[PDB]
Amino acid sequence: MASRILLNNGAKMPILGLGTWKSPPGQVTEAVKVAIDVGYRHIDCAHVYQNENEVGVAIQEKLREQVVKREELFIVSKLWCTYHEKGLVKGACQKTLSDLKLDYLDLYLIHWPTGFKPGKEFFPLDESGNVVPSDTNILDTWAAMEELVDEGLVKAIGISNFNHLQVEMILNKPGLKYKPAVNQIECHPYLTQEKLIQYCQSKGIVVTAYSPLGSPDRPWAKPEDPSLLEDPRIKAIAAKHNKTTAQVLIRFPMQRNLVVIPKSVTPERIAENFKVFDFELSSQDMTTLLSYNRNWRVCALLSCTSHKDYPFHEEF
Ligand SMILES: NC(=O)c1ccc[n+]([C@@H]2O[C@H](COP(=O)([O-])OP(=O)(O)OC[C@H]3O[C@@H](n4cnc5c(N)ncnc54)[C@H](OP(=O)(O)O)[C@@H]3O)[C@@H](O)[C@H]2O)c1
Ligand SMILES: O=C(O)COc1cc(Cl)ccc1C(=O)NCc1ccc(Br)cc1
Known part of the structure; x- marks a missing residue:
């Protein structure tokens, strides 16, 4: 299987990338250095991280060491919810560019479909704990993203955590100039996303699977939650293939024509997670992994559930 997938902007995107949410600032520089040394060419970032x-x-x-050329890297970041406004989008993108020390991003995503009140706080709350919305809508935010392409700041634009109706809304936008290249969504054997993936793929949108290992380090994890990495059924498939459970969990989305972005700051795991291009899951393995769906989400947040554009009320 090829290492890159063709996007609807004509560029190629590496199907394996390194995630960086929760990577401590004192460890992530070495994590990314190691990742690039061992072959990663795609890093998933966000201002909110x-x-x-x-x-x-x-x-x-x-880049300075000439380990890689800029054209060989695929750097992704995301516009945070408190920057959905017309007058804030460019500056948010530019702050990310300045921090990443880049002149352009390969892909810039609307991180969540919900706009929040601008200000210093990433999650502005009212006195009762509800997020404070902005009156911005996804269509006007999309127009602002299109401007970034036309100014040379980003090569591609996309969306993240958009449900099927929200993806459709963008595709049906009056005067749409650029289709979203990517929808980045949670996806793993406990949240298999068959409906949303089929819809996006049918429209030529590439899907990126986040939390492919079930985000065991998510800060809201409870001791009782299901655990992909410890699931004996998945361990058994791994054992059959002489691979680790994590390697199976990474190869799984790859064979569904998804991009996948496992996070690690452990050098040995960063390397392990990249060694997924030399084995194949059978169709029976794939269907078996799909059968584990339980509609379980890592990524959800009670404080944001009443926002008009919160994505997880719809079935898909
Ligand atoms: N668009 C969005 O809204 C959104 C939401 C969530 C995530 N994401 C992106 O997707 C990335 C991945 O998702 P995630 O960070 O939630 O979780 P994940 O990649 O599913 O899991 C990361 C956890 O798995 C551990 N791990 C990594 N490789 C392992 C291995 N080979 N064996 C055992 N454990 C291993 C890591 O530990 P160590 O680091 O200690 O090694 C870390 O605790 C994020 O970092 C972020 O870039 C995007
Ligand atoms: O959103 C992400 O990429 C990962 O999740 C978070 C990362 C940070 Cl740095 C801070 C908060 C979260 C989080 O709570 N995500 C869940 C969530 C769900 C719906 C909305 Br709208 C916003 C966040």
């Missing part, structure tokens, strides 16, 4: 400066130090050092 608060570590783009440190990710950027690594990228810049590897």
Whole structure:
């Protein structure tokens, strides 16, 4: 299987990338350096992760060392919810560019479909704990994203955590100039996303699977939640293939024509996670993994559920 997938902007995107949410700032520079050394060419970033400066130090050092050329890297970031406004989008993108020490992004995503009140706080709340919305809509935010392409700041634009109706809304936007290249969504054997993936793929939108290992380090994890990495059924498939459970969990989305972005700051795991291009899951393995769906989401947040554009009320 090829290492890159063709996007609807004509560029190629590496199907394996390194995730950076929760990567501590004192560890992420080395994580990214190691990743690039062992073959990663795609890094998934976001302003809200608060570590783009440190990710950027690594990228810049590897460019300076001439380990890789800029054209060989595929750097992704995301517009946070408090920047949905027309007058804030460019500056948000530019802050990310400055922190990452880049002149352009390969892909810039609307991080969540919901706009929040601008200000210093990433999750502005009212006194009762509800997020404070902005009156911005996804269509006007999309127009602002299109401007970034036309100014040369980003090569591609896309969306993240958009449900099927929201993707459709963008595709049906009056005067749409650029289709979204990517929808980045949670996807793993406990949240298999068959409906949304089929819709997006049918429209030529590439899907990126986040939290492919079930995000065991998510800060809201409870001791009782299901655990992909410990699931004996998945362990059995891994054992049959002489691979680790994580390697199976990474190969799974790859064979569905998805991009996948496992996170690690452990050098041995960063390397392990990349060694997924030399084995194949059978069709029976794939269907078996799909059968584990339980509609379980890592990524959801009670404080945001009443926002008009919160994505997880719809079935898909
Ligand atoms: N667009 C969005 O809204 C959104 C939401 C969530 C995530 N994402 C992106 O997707 C990325 C991945 O998702 P995620 O960070 O939620 O979780 P994940 O990649 O599913 O899991 C990361 C966890 O798995 C551990 N791990 C990694 N490789 C392992 C291996 N080979 N064996 C055992 N454990 C391993 C990591 O530990 P160590 O790091 O300690 O090694 C870390 O605790 C994020 O970092 C972010 O870039 C985007
Ligand atoms: O959104 C992500 O990429 C990962 O999740 C988070 C990352 C940070 Cl740095 C801070 C908060 C979250 C989080 O709570 N995500 C869940 C969520 C769900 C719906 C909306 Br709208 C916003 C966040």
